[PDB]
Amino acid sequence: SAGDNINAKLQLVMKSGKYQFGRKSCLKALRTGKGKLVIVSSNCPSIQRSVIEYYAMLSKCGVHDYHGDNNDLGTACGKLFRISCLVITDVGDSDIIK
Amino acid sequence: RMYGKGKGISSSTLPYKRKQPSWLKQKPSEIEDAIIKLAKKGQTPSQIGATLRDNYGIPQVKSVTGNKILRILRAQGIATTIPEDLYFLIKKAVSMRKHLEKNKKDKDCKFRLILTESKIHRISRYYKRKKLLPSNWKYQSSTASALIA
Amino acid sequence: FTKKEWYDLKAPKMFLVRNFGKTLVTKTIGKKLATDSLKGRIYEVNLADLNNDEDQAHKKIKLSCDHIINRDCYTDFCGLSITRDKLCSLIRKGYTLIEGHTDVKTLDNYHLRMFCIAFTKKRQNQTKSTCYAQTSQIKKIRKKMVDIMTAEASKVLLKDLVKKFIPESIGKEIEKQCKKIYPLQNVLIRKVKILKRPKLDISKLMELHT
Amino acid sequence: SRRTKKVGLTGKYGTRYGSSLRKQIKKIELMQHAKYLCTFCGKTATKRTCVGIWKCKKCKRKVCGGAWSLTTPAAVAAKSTIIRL
Amino acid sequence: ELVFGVAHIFASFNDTFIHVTDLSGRETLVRITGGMKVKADRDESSPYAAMMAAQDVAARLKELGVTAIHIKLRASGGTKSKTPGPGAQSALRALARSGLKIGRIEDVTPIPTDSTRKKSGRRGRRL
Amino acid sequence: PKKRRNGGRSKHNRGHVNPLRCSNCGRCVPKDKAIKRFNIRNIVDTSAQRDIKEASVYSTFQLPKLYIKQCYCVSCAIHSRFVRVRSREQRRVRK
Amino acid sequence: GKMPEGTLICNLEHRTGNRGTLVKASGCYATVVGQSEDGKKTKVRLPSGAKKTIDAKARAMVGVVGAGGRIDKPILKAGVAHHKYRVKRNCWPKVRGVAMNPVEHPHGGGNHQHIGHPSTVSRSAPAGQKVGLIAARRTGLLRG
RNA sequence: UUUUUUUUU
RNA sequence: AGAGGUGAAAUUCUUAGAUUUUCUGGAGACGAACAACUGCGAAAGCAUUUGUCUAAAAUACUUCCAUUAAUCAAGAACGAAAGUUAAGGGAGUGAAGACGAUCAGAUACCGUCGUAAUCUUAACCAUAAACUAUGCCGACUAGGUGUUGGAUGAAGUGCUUCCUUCAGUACCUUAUGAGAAAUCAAAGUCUUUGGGUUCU
RNA sequence: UUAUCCAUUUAUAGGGAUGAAUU
């Protein structure tokens, strides 16, 4: 249930609100602030992780460190690759804000 | 019950009143003008009736309008290709296999996967017997994930 | 033997007797120090004898000799235990048992682990032989009781923790708040143990023992 | 189709050596060369590189490991006890 | 000047151990057992040896000086047995009769949450 | 001949029950089949309980009981002179 | 003498300053099974199953030597043994002493290829005599 | 604690 | 100066301090007491805590489909323990075995030790008195005592009890019901013989 | 520990609370 909150909230915002996936998508959205919420992978090197978290509190966007390597948001959402970094463009009727 | 034991007679008992009740002054016109509105928002017909009878207070859509609910989603080309029961079963099977992909020691869980796979196969055969399901459609387990559409 | 000498033992100032008995210390000869042989040992006393009342006969206190001056050993609280005979006397058929345990942190950086027993109450109108509890409320009450115990032990010290253990003040408010969820019979804290104690601060023990 | 019903990779050994001996290296052949999972990239593609040296197909950074496995049951337990402290 | 010690009685359907130490458990004062007296390889658990193995420790305790004593009762262990042997009744009787001051009493027989299986197989003891 | 309706055990709606060991012989018996007695005893019989009372202190010390909860295998229970073989007709009534 | 007991160590230093002496073969490890109360002394259990007392200042690596389980796979053929010992020594092939002539080996000689005399030799046996089972305490299959 | 045995109708 | 052990005994450990007291760690194991003619699961089986993933069941519905159903040779999944293969682990128990006693004999029952096994992982094996010895689905036939999870109405102090009712779940009595009987509320509704079906 | 013996090195800092860094 605790991780179900994150998993289900992400899965539901994907369908309801507008969504994007990819490190290029995240950088493109977070060099303008379009990326609403930003996720950093645990497996990815801290060099990858800390600049991406850096982007967040310039952009006033919520950054979270997902414990994992390539799963769920990179496997269950719509894709089959190693995502290693996440960002959401738009939000529907989703409580992902809190 | 198809699998396991237990009768479980819990269900919904429709009233004897075939027509609409006297208080149901709400016209069948705007009663029909409330279902496709909620439908294209994105909503399963199994829950469309529930929300109509909870918020709009209009039970027995068949009684209030001389047509069935899937009939009045199906007469205007907004019904999904995959039926609701089959879609809700294949999503369960997809979750089944996503779990078993990493958790392969869940032998009871994969037994339940076998049970729901058999359910999907027989229900799909039934829907195939009717013309509303394509004969080419096969439900390959590999593409079950993309079959949700 | 004929050389071993008696050393009187002392309790912290909070206890009204401050003295329960004497230990024995062997030959004070050669390189073996008869001060660390006495030090770092455990004395198991009963609250009934230690407070001259029969009410506190169902639990016992362990005192570790922390330091020695002159000859009287001062000791210090290190563990609490209830008597297993009273525990099994309390245990009875028909009532579900509930266990709780957690690690707490005091402002003294003291690591304490306490285990708590919990029973269910038959009340008056049940008219049934059994008083079993559906496991979801066991879930909920165990979680809530662990939470409140950690909350009460986080913002207090060890000595006042003993001050509140003596009147079994921990076993009252839990019943008070459980009266609104599920009635519980007499419950208590079974055992409290020290995991890791900070470096021995001699300045923090004189003003407490005296 | 399927040329070897049971012998599998040991087909390179022909009829030589004992059946039970080839079958005892049948406990190990399916895992000495197998594509196991790396912890710095995330693809199940690691391959044997030497007797103790290991490497996947993405990271280009080698790792000390078991004789024919990336990790050994002793070494995962030993690491777990150390981590617990 | 009243002084307290602790005596551990061990009854295991054999020689009844009497182990008198100070209140810390450490630094034992006198240990007497039950086989220290009878040389017949029998009556080790019997009241015969059990109660005559206690007035001697009462006298030794008297000449040592300590008067008031607590008692801890032991019944084998967590796997062997759970009830004290015949020697415990006589051990208590002799301490009562000797005039030795007796304080608090407790049972500390080790009770396992564990279930390490005991002697003999599923068939159990056949005698 | 189906001597007992329950078959000698109290197992219903179950397939397996974790067993236990008999106290006097160690025979492995299913938990619902073993003869279980929560034994309450005096560590000292009343005759010497009076003695420990008069030789004790606090003038109000009370004897704590012994709580065993022993279990026996069926084979040794009847030999222990506790379980009655009793009669066929009255076999049914338990209490 | 810094790590707690029960931990697994490798590259042991049986005397402070040898920069690595014990527990160095692949897959081997020692376990620290005790520390002296006054420090300056600890007990370890070596891969041979023996307990050794080493001072607390001795250094070691925490972990298990890599390439573990190397002896698990069977050397299929003489070729792998040849390649293995080619980079190590001249200890292979062995050649039985009972297949040699009596001049080159006490086992050699005879018309039936047998040892002829007990193969458990004394610990005091000279260089040319220490050839069988050297000072064997027992023989035959072990029973645990 | 130990106690094996008893042609043929 | 004994300690284990036994109906006795002996094997065995013990002045280098055994057993015993207390404290500290390490190891593997199990999860008592609560714990029940109680719950879950297709069966095998499943009891420390917490978290996550996944399922199942009942209840309530004026939600949806509309026959999509039942039983099933072949064919498949799971399948106690023991056993096999290979690693890790190896406390306690302990087939083999080694001794010590009883016995006329004891290769056994009893005692001490003790390899494999028991434990973890990855594969096989597919058998158990795998037993309520009772195949599954459906209809009907009797009262009471319980008890588990809901739901309904009312009333001791928002809390808690009683009524009714579903889905389990056992028990007692009764049969102008059955059976050869033991017994069975199904093993009844069967010479007044046919609800459907699989296996033997 | 002084005889004696052993080990290590460039005989290279007195005891307690996947980037560098020399003038």
Swiss-Prot record, chain C:
Keywords: Cytoplasm, Ribonucleoprotein, Ribosomal protein. Its main location: cytoplasm. One of its GO terms (cellular component) is cytosolic small ribosomal subunit. One of its GO terms (biological process) is translation. The keyword Ribosomal protein applies. Transmembrane segments: none annotated. GO terms for molecular function: structural constituent of ribosome. It comes from the Eukaryota. It is found in: Cytoplasm. Component of the ribosome, a large ribonucleoprotein complex responsible for the synthesis of proteins in the cell. The small ribosomal subunit (SSU) binds messenger RNAs (mRNAs) and translates the encoded message by selecting cognate aminoacyl-transfer RNA (tRNA) molecules. The large subunit (LSU) contains the ribosomal catalytic site termed the peptidyl transferase center (PTC), which catalyzes the formation of peptide bonds, thereby polymerizing the amino acids delivered by tRNAs into a polypeptide chain. Component of the small ribosomal subunit. Mature ribosomes consist of a small (40S) and a large (60S) subunit. The 40S subunit contains about 32 different proteins and 1 molecule of RNA (18S). The 60S subunit contains about 42 different proteins and 3 molecules of RNA (28S, 5.8S and 5S). Belongs to the eukaryotic ribosomal protein eS1 family. This is Small ribosomal subunit protein eS1. It comes from Plasmodium falciparum (isolate 3D7).
Curated annotation (Swiss-Prot), chain D:
This is Large ribosomal subunit protein eL43. HAMAP family: Ribosomal_eL43 (MF_00327). Component of the large ribosomal subunit. Mature ribosomes consist of a small (40S) and a large (60S) subunit. The 40S subunit contains about 32 different proteins and 1 molecule of RNA (18S). The 60S subunit contains about 42 different proteins and 3 molecules of RNA (28S, 5.8S and 5S). It comes from Plasmodium falciparum (isolate 3D7). GO terms for biological process: translation. The keyword DNA damage does not apply. A zinc finger (C4-type) spans 38-59. SUPFAM superfamilies: Zn-binding ribosomal proteins (SSF57829).
